[PDB]
Ligand binder design. Structure first.
Ligand SMILES: Nc1ncnc2c1ncn2[C@@H]1O[C@H](COP(=O)(O)OP(=O)(O)OP(O)(O)=S)[C@@H](O)[C@H]1O
Ligand SMILES: Nc1ncnc2c1ncn2[C@@H]1O[C@H](COP(=O)(O)OP(=O)(O)OP(O)(O)=S)[C@@H](O)[C@H]1O
Lengths: 624, 85
């Protein structure tokens, strides 16, 4: 009767129909049974990485016993699930734990070998009751004679951290290696599990959902194992769909929540006795109106759809895989097809010229959302080089902004400090046993979180010619391994290597300097090797416009603006001389010609905030 | 890409070949007598057969070349065997 108090009954629940169906894994249950019915030392231990199904096998064995598919020796055996947590509950005295253990062992032995105990995560049995080794090995005499059977299951690396350190007890256990299944098997598993979820959430599930989940959960989420990271997607999709069968769907409930906040802000900002908050209000109202338009449009379209979405499909799974591990995995639902077709002209707002290199980046971004590029290879690996001041770093910063709306979201490393060979260790970590080890790598541990960024290697030509080799595997496929032995995936980042070889020689001399500075097997990894071009006087007026736009945007903090005459706008670009320093002289000239005079006149009255100022050319300089 | 490493990891591999054993910190001897050991490389880079066979000999030691089985040499791609790739 001690059992009734210190353990539950598994076979009883299997009869009462409370365990999930178990599909496949025939070899494993066969081996478990045949080990479980031998003469001496019959103690199978299911071992293997976490998630691949190790409790599911024991539940399958229980349902199999209830059914009758077992051999003769295992008829009516009444599996029992032990519990060592509720056994050490209150035993602060000297013998209170050994007493309970002896009672349970005696009642297991009194039965005619019927009971089949089952300790889940038996790596906790080692130090059961400590004080001096006495407890947890009182069963060691009964294991050998095979009186109690004890099918248990622990993870693969808590078996050599807790048990293998006890070689006298490992001897009494037989290991059953449970390897993870493939996609074709996971699909079959899901096809039989697609009823409990479909009934718990009042929805229906298409078979395409199962297929797409079992595929995407293997392609993207490279940190868990397969029978589980595929069930999670299905489960979350179903829960979301049931949440939307409530009153309103998403994308209407978000816009109404935004509108309410904008309203409650505009209602309480109106009574502000100020003049600078007048413009800080003049935009809030416009925003509220332009959002209420969208709300009304969505609400009307819902009415049409409802007078003229009830099962999960192969794209809601993509929405989940995008919301978790923010890699975009969708199918271009018309929100951004226009954007990806406008990409070139949109990156033109910040970068000017070098269409030969803008088109090359845009094409690599584009043919990956359409699902055409190599799924196991980086999303693109370019090294664009050319003379200075031309805009290579600028294009790399414009791309990250166009993609994530925050230029500080990309991962940037400056390869000008890696001049010494030994300085490699700061991006792959330090081996075990050395000073900085628990911190892990640095590039690795940044790409391991949010693996959608853009990676930038400035001035690649200045690092020692031995950091070039840590990038071979990184460019050819997405793998790089830190100290702890974990591996990160680069398969969906966009690498970029800005350089400066062959300052202004030719488009042929620079291709003869690259081939002498790099190795034949390293150039072979790259995509197109883009070459940038010097700037023309006609490409420079637009840069003047950009600089003035930025300066005005910065000045608008103090409520100013400038009226620049076209004579001055062309004078500035006329003084952007010397196509040997690119386009920085323009910046320093704008400073030395406008910023200093503006400061002068600004911190001495006469240009008080508010009113704008005009700028006009003079004989030589330009005055205000 | 084995020739890119430091010539001490070779000496670690020295007993993996020819015996299939190496023991870690915990003092557990691990056996390799059933694996298939494969080492790629890119030495020589164009030498016919003895600009490469003598560039292996000057980067590795005889006691390391001696454990190996045949040192396979790969060959460039003819125009015919690309219409199939
Ligand atoms: N062969 C299978 N048939 C049916 N369901 C399975 C199968 N393998 C795994 N599952 C399900 O996938 C999940 C796997 O969970 P478990 O296998 O119980 O966890 P585990 O594999 O024991 O890993 P730990 O170490 O116990 S956390 C559960 O939801 C199971 O129901
Ligand atoms: N085509 C361009 N379009 C817009 N701004 C440009 C362009 N070319 C240069 N600029 C400006 O020039 C600044 C400096 O150019 P960068 O590209 O940062 O220098 P670089 O191209 O990296 O050359 P090096 O070798 O790195 S010094 C940028 O911040 C821009 O403001």
């Amino acid at each position: 009767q001690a059992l009734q108090k210190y353990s539950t009954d598994l076979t009883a629940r299997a009869r009462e129909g409370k365990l999930d169906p178990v599909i496949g894994r025939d070899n494993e249950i066969r081996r478990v049974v045949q080990v479980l019915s031998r003469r001496t030392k019959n103690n199978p231990v299911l071992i293997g990485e976490p998630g691949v199904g190790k409790t599911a096998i024991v539940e399958g064995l229980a349902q199999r016993i209830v059914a009758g598919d077992v051999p003769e020796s295992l008829r009516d055996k009444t599996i029992v699930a032990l519990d060592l947590g509720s056994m050490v509950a209150g035993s602060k005295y000297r013998g209170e734990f050994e007493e309970r253990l002896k009672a349970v062992l005696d009642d297991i032995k009194n039965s005619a070998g019927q009971i089949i105990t089952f300790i889940d995560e038996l790596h906790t049995i080692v130090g059961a009751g400590a004080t001096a080794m006495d407890a947890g090995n009182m069963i060691k005499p009964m294991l050998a004679r095979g009186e109690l059977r004890l099918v248990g299951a622990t993870t693969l690396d808590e078996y050599r951290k807790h048990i293998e350190k006890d070689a006298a007890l490992e001897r009494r256990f037989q290991q059953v290696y449970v390897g993870e299944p493939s996609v074709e098997d996971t699909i079959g598993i899901l096809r039989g599990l697609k009823d409990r979820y479909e009934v718990h959430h009042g929805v229906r599930i298409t078979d395409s959902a199962l297929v797409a989940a079992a595929t995407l959960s293997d392609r993207y989420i490279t940190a868990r194992f397969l029978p589980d990271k595929a069930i999670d997607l299905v489960d979350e999709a179903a829960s979301r769909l049931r949440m939307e069968i409530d009153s309103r769907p998403v994308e209407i409930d978000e816009v109404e929540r935004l509108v309410r906040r904008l309203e409650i802000e505009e209602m309480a900002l109106s009574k502000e006795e100020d003049e600078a908050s007048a413009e800080r209000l003049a935009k809030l109202r416009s925003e509220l109106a332009d959002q209420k338009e969208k709300l009304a449009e969505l609400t009307t379209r819902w009415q049409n759809e409802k007078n003229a979405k009830e099962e999960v499909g192969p794209d809601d799974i993509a929405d989940v895989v995008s919301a978790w591990t923010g890699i975009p995995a969708g199918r271009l639902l018309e929100g951004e097809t226009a954007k990806l077709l406008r990409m070139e002209d949109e990156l033109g707002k910040r970068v000017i010229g070098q269409k030969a290199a803008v088109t090359a980046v845009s094409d690599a971004v584009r043919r990956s959302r359409a699902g055409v590029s190599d799924p196991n290879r980086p999303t693109g690996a370019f090294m664009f080089l050319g003379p200075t001041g031309v805009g290579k770093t600028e294009l790399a910063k414009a791309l990250a902004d166009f993609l994530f709306d925050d230029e500080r979201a990309m991962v940037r490393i400056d390869m000008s400090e890696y001049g010494e060979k030994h300085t490699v260790a700061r991006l792959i970590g330090a081996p075990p046993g050395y000073v900085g080890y628990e911190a892990g790598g640095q590039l690795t541990e940044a790409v391991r979180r949010r693996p959608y960024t853009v990676v930038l290697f400035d001035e690649i030509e200045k690092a020692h010619p031995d950091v070039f080799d840590v990038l071979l595997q990184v460019l050819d496929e997405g793998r790089l391994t830190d100290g702890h032995g974990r591996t990160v995936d680069f398969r969906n980042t966009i690498l970029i290597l800005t350089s400066n070889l062959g300052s202004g020689g030719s488009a042929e001399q620079v291709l003869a300097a690259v081939r002498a500075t790099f190795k034949p097997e390293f150039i072979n990894r790259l995509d197109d090797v883009l070459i940038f071009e010097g700037l023309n006087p006609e490409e420079l007026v637009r840069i003047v416009d950009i600089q003035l736009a930025q300066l005005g945007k910065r000045l608008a903090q103090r409520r100013l603006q400038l009226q620049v005459s076209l004579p001055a706008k062309r004078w500035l670009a006329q003084r952007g001389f010397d196509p040997v320093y690119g386009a920085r002289p323009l910046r320093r000239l704008v400073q030395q010609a406008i910023g200093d005079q503006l400061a002068k006149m600004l911190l001495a009255g006469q240009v008080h905030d508010g009113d704008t100022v005009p700028v006009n050319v003079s004989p030589d300089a330009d005055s205000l």
